[PDB]
Amino acid sequence: GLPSTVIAISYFEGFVKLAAEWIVTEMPTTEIDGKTYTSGKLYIKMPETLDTDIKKSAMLFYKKQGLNETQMSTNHRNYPIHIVSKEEGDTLEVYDMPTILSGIDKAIDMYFRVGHIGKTTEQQLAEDNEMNNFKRVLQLLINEDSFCRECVEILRQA
Amino acid sequence: GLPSTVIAISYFEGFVKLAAEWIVTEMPTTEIDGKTYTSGKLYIKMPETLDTDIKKSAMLFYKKQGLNETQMSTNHRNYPIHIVSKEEGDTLEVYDMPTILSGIDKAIDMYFRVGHIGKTTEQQLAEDNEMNNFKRVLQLLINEDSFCRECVEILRQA
Ligand SMILES: Nc1nc2c(ncn2[C@@H]2O[C@@H]3COP(=O)(O)O[C@H]4[C@@H](O)[C@H](n5cnc6c(=O)[nH]c(N)nc65)O[C@@H]4COP(=O)(O)O[C@H]3[C@H]2O)c(=O)[nH]1
């Protein structure tokens, strides 16, 4: 019963699965700012470290990658899925850094950050373990979904 | 620690806090479908039971309450916060059923929901414990935030 497992499941059910389904079944028939894409990819970007504010790391990564704000109209949620994306030739490259990981940080930040300001090596190990388990569960869920296996990737670099 | 704790923290950081901040500091100067409200409330609706699809229960509850889709404009996220709401006199009543709980359900289904089809009383016990811990952690986070303490409530009835 790891919390990163539940976080990965919630992230997959509430975003990754719907985004992959939109890429596979709706994007080829949807015009995004004038263009019609035949191929799309969703890239999951992990934070370099689980810092105090994952939203700021996400904003910085999106601006440094030259992404623009777009949205996908889905039928499995009452409101569209907001994303950041860019064009690479004929491919629509969507990126996302999972903001749901925020809680994870605070959880670790409430168990190890004691009697000191920085991050002990034990906090770093527990953080890396939670990160790796999140990535493993997310990859297992992606592999069991045809659309996700088709168009979703977890980014490698740190 | 407990996955319900991390789920509550992520739900508070990614929605409840921002919605309360919008209600307190941005709603009195924003037109919601033509009207400008001076008082607003956010009501958190827990599912009666943690069923297979929390999005369907949420849609059903929203239709049974006569709610309509609106959106809040926030400066802490690159895209607006989508909500369901209604008008009660001069008060804007916002409702939300936390879809993030979905993962929790599935997690429980991988430790007890075996060798049977339904939900045993022991699995139901663990599910109720996770739900109660989620509600308690969320309430503790609400009480430590002035805006949330001002305008956020967890619904009573089952
Ligand atoms: N780029 C992008 N990512 C998405 C989107 N929808 C979900 N995600 C990601 O998937 C995670 C789980 O979403 P959730 O299950 O609906 O669980 C959500 C959801 O219950 C609530 N929440 C967040 N934003 C909203 C909102 O705008 N409206 C409502 N009614 N609830 C929200 O807080 C919980 C946590 O949200 P997050 O921490 O950000 O964590 C979210 C987020 O990282 C999207 O449209 N665009």
Numbering used by the authors:
A (entry chain A), B (entry chain B): 157 to 314
Please share excerpts from the published article on this structure.
We turned to prepare SeMet-labeled PcSTING and solved the structure at 2.25-Å resolution. Although no nucleotide was included in the crystallization solution, the strong electron-density unambiguously identified the bound CDN as c-di-GMP. In addition to the specific H-bonding interaction, each guanine base of c-di-GMP is sandwiched by extensive π–π stacking interaction formed by F171 of one PcSTING protomer and Y235 of the other protomer. The planar guanidinium group of R233 also stacks with the aromatic ring of Y235, forming a unique Phe/Guanine/Tyr/Arg four-layer stack buttressed by the four H-bond interactions between R233 and c-di-GMP. By contrast, in PcSTING/MySTING the stacking interaction of R233/R230 and Y235/Y232 locks the conformation of the guanidinium group of R233/R230 into specific hydrogen bonds with the O6 and N7 atoms of c-di-GMP. Moreover, mutating the specificity-determining residue D252 or R233 in PcTIR-STING relieved the growth inhibition, validating the importance of these two residues in recognition of c-di-GMP. Each V-shaped dimer of PcSTING associates with its neighbors on both sides, which are symmetry-related by unit-cell translation along the c axis. The small helix α5 interacts with helix α2 of the other dimer by both hydrophobic and ionic interactions including two salt-bridges (K212–D301, K220–E306), one hydrogen bond (S213–S302), and the close side-chain packing of F303, K212, M215, and L216. The loop connecting helix α3 and α4 (denoted 3–4 loop, residues 267–276) in PcSTING intercalated into a groove formed by helix α1 and α4 of protomer A’ and the 3–4 loop of protomer B’ of the other dimer. The interactions are mediated mainly by the protein backbone with additional side-chain contacts of I273 and M266.
